[model samples]
Structure formats: C-alpha cells, structure tokens
Target: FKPEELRQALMPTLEALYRQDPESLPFRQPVDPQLLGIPDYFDIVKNPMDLSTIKRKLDTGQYQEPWQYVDDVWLMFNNAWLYNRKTSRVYKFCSKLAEVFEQEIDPVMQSL
Candidate 1:
C-alpha cells in the first residue's frame, strides 16, 4: 500500500470524512476461518441485499434449519480487525481478536 503526503491546502470536505472515529487493533494469522462456518468461498453472500435475505431465512420454519447454525452465522460480521505489532506494520490489520467465551478461540471475538 502507498503512504501519501498531507495536503498543504485545505478545501471543503464532508464532516464525516474529517472526523476522528473510534478505533482498536488486532494480531494473528486468521485462525481457522472455517470455524466461523458462515460460508465457504463460493457460498459467501457477496451483496448486502443478498446477505440480508439469507439472514431472514433464519427464522423461517420453511427452511427448518437448526437454530444453532443460524446463531453461528450471525457471528461473522463486524467489518474490521487490528494490526498485530509482532507480525505486522503499524498500518496493517485494522482488526483484532479475543474470546469472552470458554475456549481460547477467535470466533466469539470482536475486532480492533
């Protein structure tokens, strides 16, 4: 990725574009991505609309899938992670991981 120079000149910009938002950091090889069990490569719901449709299917008795699997699918999104100091540069990996659940695993965790 290319790091860039700061602008010497100021111009009108969107307020959301200039503000400091919240943040956090992460570190790790993605530990067992299969554990999330939401999708395999081909099965992934690529569009937000399509993903929401699948989410709606969860409560429909017509599909009659197990509720446990449905809950696991809900675990997959936070859109972020953090950079690990040891394995990555300060600019890498915006998401981090941890488990508030029983075992030492990444699935039930939040990101950076």
Candidate 2:
C-alpha cells in the first residue's frame, strides 16, 4: 500500500484506541517522570513513546513502513507496563489499549 493510504487507515485506529477510556490520559501524551514524581522512570524506559508522538510522526511522513508505526504504539504500552505495577491503572489501560490495538490493526496491516 502507499504510505499515505497506510497513514489514513491508521488514524482511525488511533482514535479508537484513545476513545477506549473516558479521558485516555495514560496514552495520550508522553510521560513526564518528574511531574509524576517517578524520577527513575526514564532509567527503565529508554525508548518512550505516545499516541500524540505517533500521530506527529505519521503527519510528518516519518514512518517509511507501517511496522515503524506499529512498533511505536507497542512501545508506548510496553513502556507503561515496564514502569508501572501490574495493578496500577496505567498498566491496566495499556493492556486494554494493546488488545484493542491488535484487533483494530490486523485488517489494515494484512492489506499490506
């Protein structure tokens, strides 16, 4: 598929993922460890990512392949899972988002 087509297809999926929670706070933006008072967060999560960052990359045509976008989405969730306790709300949100992301992205990715 053309890069533009892939980007178009993924945008709605991203919106759906964001709409999973009422606020979608956890995944909407990059995590601020200092603000959250978890100064050690960056030490564990070396490659942080977020929904807004992914969208920006898509808009800027930075994703040369669909896998690049997919990896960023996973990275966002994985980072949360890595830093937060499994019982934490952020980790739970990541689990739900990852499940929904898998279901929503399959068709679009298979088309490529």
Candidate 3:
C-alpha cells in the first residue's frame, strides 16, 4: 500500500487504542510516534528494540515491500502476547484488531 492510504486505513484504530485513557486500560498512553517507541505497559510482551531491528532492516532495503514489513511487525506483536502472560482482554483486543487488518486493510493494500 502507498504509505498515505495505509495510514488512513490503520491510524484511527491505532490512535483509539493508544489514546485509551490510562484510567480504564492497563497500558500507558502511546507515544507521539507510536511506531517509533516501545510500549511501556507491555514490557514483558515486546520491547521497542525489537521494532528498531525491523526498522533498521527495512531502512537498509533488506525487506522487499513496506507492507511485508508491516505484516512482520504485526506478527511480532502478536507473538509477544502469546509469549507473555497478559490478560485475556488484551489478547481478545489484539486478535480482533488483527482480524480487522487481515480482512479490511490487507485487501486494500494488496489492491494497491
């Protein structure tokens, strides 16, 4: 997907998730460059360093396509949840979002 279209499709959902008030959610408010920093609340699950590695590889042209990199990043996050003892609600939310991306966003990306 072109970067702009990808952002349009996915940013809102991510913003909502990130902006969720700390009063209600276990996670902290997401960083401004949510894509740039490691999430603090789920430290046991995955660290920002993992994302940094992906970014470095992509920046170096090791990855063929940006969407492919996105898919990999999503998978890493999903795997992190599985490896950690996070709450079921967290798992459910992540699973639902993954379904949305697979069902809604990915097709749009592929068409591009």
Candidate 4:
C-alpha cells in the first residue's frame, strides 16, 4: 500500500479509537516522570511511548508499514506493563487498551 493511503487510513482510526476510551486517559500524554515523582520511570521504560508521540509520528508521515504504527501503540502499553506491578490497575488498563486496539484495528490493517 502507498504511504499516503496508509496515512489516511490509520490516523483517523487512531483518533477515534483512542478518543472513545476512558481507559486511554493515562496513555494519551507523555509520562512526566519528575511530576509523577517516579524518577526511575525512565530507567525502567527505556523506550517510552505515548499516544501524543504516536500521533506526532503519524501526522509527520513517519510510518512506512502499518505494523510500525501498531508497534508504537504496543510499545506505549508495554511500557506501562514494565513500570507497573501486574497487580496494579494500571497494568490491567494497558492490557485492556492493547486488546481493544488489536480488535478494533485488525480490519483496518487488513484493508491494506
């Protein structure tokens, strides 16, 4: 598929999927390690990812393959998983969001 077509198809879907979910609130912005008082956050999450960063990349046409976009979304959620305890609700939120993304976007990805 053409990059332009990918861009067109992916961005709108991302916006809708992300906006509609309450579970998405935490992942929507970059983690403020200092503000959140988790100084070690960056140490744990070596490659921190967030929705804003993903959107920025999408807006700037930084993706080639559709999986690249999906990869970044997983990176964001996995970072949460890495940082939070499995017992924490944050971990569950990440899992739920990731599952939602997989189910919601499978058809979109298949179109290409």
Candidate 5:
C-alpha cells in the first residue's frame, strides 16, 4: 500500500482513539519530532512529531495528502515521556505500581 494512503486512513482514526488520553500526559517541553523534511508539506500546532510525519517524508516524492497525523509513535513517545516526567503523578505511580511486588520479602526486597 502507498504510505500516503495508509497515513491518510489512519491519522484521524488514531487521533480520535487517543482523545486527550495522551493530553493527560504533561510535557516539560515540546518534544522534538527528531525527523525533518516533509514528504509533501506539513505545518501547524504544538510540538510537531509522530509516525505519519515520518512516513510522509518517506513518501513525499509521490505523497502528501491529508491530515496524516503521526499518531502511535508520537503517542508512545509522548506518553512515555509524559509519564516519566519526574514532574509527579508519573514516578509516584510508577514507584507504587511496583510496590505490590515488594515487601519484607516481596517487590520483593532483598533482606540484609
């Protein structure tokens, strides 16, 4: 399938699926897309980065079509970054998340 077509079809679907779920993820700074050069054309809003963005660059020679949002990669990247943001809620939950496995002999802590 043409990368362009897949991107067009999936971009919006992906966005709707997340529905601000990632938004809950707080960013200390706008994340770098780490990729430059649009396949056809790109611009607009917030920190510009993601899966579709990367794909468009690859297909630009014969691509560039719709919203083509770079979803998953951006989601994972941003989600992980946001969650990891020492900022709070993140490490706190993360540490607690591991608590279940620990105890006097549990998460399990090694006894001295």
Candidate 6:
C-alpha cells in the first residue's frame, strides 16, 4: 500500500489503542502529545523518499520491498521518541507492533 493509505488504515487503530487508558498522574509518565497526530506519521513518508537520500536506492531497485520505506518511517519515529525521552514502554510497544506488522500484516499486503 502507499504511505497515505497505510497511514489511514493504521492511525485510527493506533489512536484507539493509545487512548484506551489515560494516566491519572501526570508525573507517572509524559503522555504522547501526538497520540492522535496521524499527520505527523504521514509526514514521515517523505523522509525516506526525499530527506534520507534513499529514494535513489529505491528507484535503482536496491530495496526489494515497499516495507523498507515503512522501516525508514519507523526509525524516524523511534528517533523522535528517543530524543524526547518518551518511555521504554512506548518503544517496546512499537517494537512489538513492528514485529506483528512484519510477520502478519506484510503477508496480507504482499498477497494484495
């Protein structure tokens, strides 16, 4: 799927999951300001294609799967979380989601 399409499919799910439980204590952890920021995720689509200078490699047929583009987007998000010191739980959750997407969601996408 294209980046925008993927964003549309996944963003709501992400939001729903994130908002399921709001923390009572603000000091317990810093909440993700962009918990509902689908646009922010969408914005990273261009990072791999333009900013990271990987577009040429993709165009040259070096990367075999569109998921590589998704990986770039994932890394960019992880870096943001890292820089902001979000939480270990958030990163762990992301990693688990990536594993699920790579193993489960990717096959469905490939079949399409």
lDDT of 5 by residue, 36-57 (tens): 2323222333344443444445
Task: Please list the C-alpha lDDT of all candidates, in the order they appear.
Answer: 0.25, 0.84, 0.48, 0.84, 0.37, 0.42
Per-residue error (Å), model 4, residue 37: 1.1
Backbone clashes in model 5: 6
lDDT ranking, best first: 2, 4, 3, 6, 5, 1
Compared with the true structure, the alpha-carbon lDDT of candidate 2 equals 0.84
Clashing pairs in 5: 39-60, 52-70, 101-107, 102-106, 102-107, 103-106
Superposing all C-alpha atoms, what RMSD in Å does each candidate have to the true structure?
17.5, 1.3, 7.8, 1.6, 15.2, 11.1
Which candidate ranks first by TM-score, i.e. highest?
Answer: 2
Better of 3 and 6 by lDDT: 3
**TM-score of predicted model 1?**
0.19
Candidate 6's residue-wise lDDT over 1-112, tens digit each?
5455544443442333233333212212323446744445445433222212333343445445556645653554455444334465645554544444455445445543
Q: How do the predictions measure up, each by TM-score?
A: 0.19, 0.92, 0.41, 0.88, 0.28, 0.30
Runs with alpha carbons beyond 4 Å of true place in candidate 3:
1-46, 49-65, 72-76, 83-87
Model 4 TM-score, 2 decimals: 0.88
Off by over 4 Å in 2: none
What TM-score would you give candidate 6 relative to the actual structure? 0.30
Backbone clash count for every predicted candidate, in the order shown: 13, 0, 0, 0, 6, 0
Could you tell me the lDDT of residue 108 within candidate 1? Answer: 22
The sequence of per-residue lDDT tens digits that candidate 1 reaches over residues 29-51 is 23233674535432443322122
Q: What tens digits encode model 2's per-residue C-alpha lDDT throughout 13-101? A: 78888787643677787888888899998899998898889889988888888888898888888888888999988888788888888
Clashing pairs in 3: none
lDDT of 5: 0.37
Sort every candidate by TM-score, greatest first: 2, 4, 3, 6, 5, 1
Candidate 4 or 1, higher lDDT: 4
